[PDB]
Symmetry: D2
Subunit: 114 residues, 4 copies
């Protein structure tokens, strides 16, 4: 299945936060309605935050996360969870190698804000 794609409510603010856990330098691309709106880059094996931004989901509400290491696409896993019928998390893990820890770049999307 395609992973890392989420439909948000339109024209809504969301937070996006990326964490690194790999020897490889991670590149996280955030696409909103098929246009790049953020790129995060960094390296850590200790969960460093390599980016955190507030973005808007625009008309279509389509948010897509892509992760690459030195231009090679990582394999993604994802899900959305809603708490109290209001608080939303869109969650992405990514795997750059063989150990299947899926934490090499971790991306958390949250909404609503404010």
């Amino acid at each position: 299945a395609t992973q890392g794609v989420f439909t948000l409510p339109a024209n809504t603010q969301f937070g996006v936060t990326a964490f690194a856990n790999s020897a490889g330098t991670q590149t996280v691309n955030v696409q909103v309605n098929n246009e790049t709106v953020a790129t995060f880059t960094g390296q850590s094996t200790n969960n460093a935050i390599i980016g955190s931004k507030v973005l808007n989901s625009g008309g279509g509400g389509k948010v897509q996360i892509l992760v690459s290491v030195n231009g090679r696409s990582s394999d993604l896993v994802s899900a959305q969870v809603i708490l109290a019928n209001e608080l939303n998390f869109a969650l992405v893990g990514s795997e750059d190698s063989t150990d299947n820890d899926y934490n090499d770049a971790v991306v958390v999307i949250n909404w609503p804000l404010g």
Copy 2:
């Protein structure tokens, strides 16, 4: 039901990250086996990160999140989600008032690291 309490595997590194979305100044306490090991305080209506740390779950693996505003306990909601049978997220929302957005402090715990 009690919320904000999670059993992690023992002696395991995990990340904890807190975001604020409220007029009220948020205090997030992180307890590991009933000892307060991190405290984050801050105010934002725009999802600012008010704390991020790497901790160890210790022998019992018990991680508890408590949130207060001006000394009053916020109401909590929480769940754990596991992706690819390996990547864990323990998620907490909190409500300090009446609107039931549950985002007033948001806490994300992730493991494994590295």
Copy 3:
């Protein structure tokens, strides 16, 4: 927090299924847009299915689950999970006594159908 309340897309067919794991006879009340549309009743300590129905979410999309045992309200816990940005589960556990297993009646709501 209020639990057992979910917003579905409008005018959508969904499934609701209840399981029992308790000495007590469970009564599961299902409301769509604040009107009762189903009642499931049954007793099992071995996960028997006590009801399964297909319903429509109507104009408002509001679905609420309440659980009681001999007229006493059970404590509820809930969350919604979305897989592949399409497949929805709304999940309820309930606690009728003191052991905090939250499985006394378990309700699974799924959509889309067909």
Copy 4:
């Protein structure tokens, strides 16, 4: 990523339930510790239950779901959710064709029982 594989606690009773939403006849295979312990075969476009059983997770706790239609493997998506630090759901969707509804066979695994 591999999907449909879950680690349960050892020697634990769990429920497995399958629903069908497809023109195609679904075959759901359930393995516990790499041995087939149930096969559900059925057809519905309206969320009928095509199997429900109580099984034991054995020493290894490994539960795997596979879904096929006329011998061809469906694409799987999955996740595990824990409520109240106690109530577990392991969730599977499957896609047998091209519409990406992921509901063609839906499998819900729940524990604890009793």
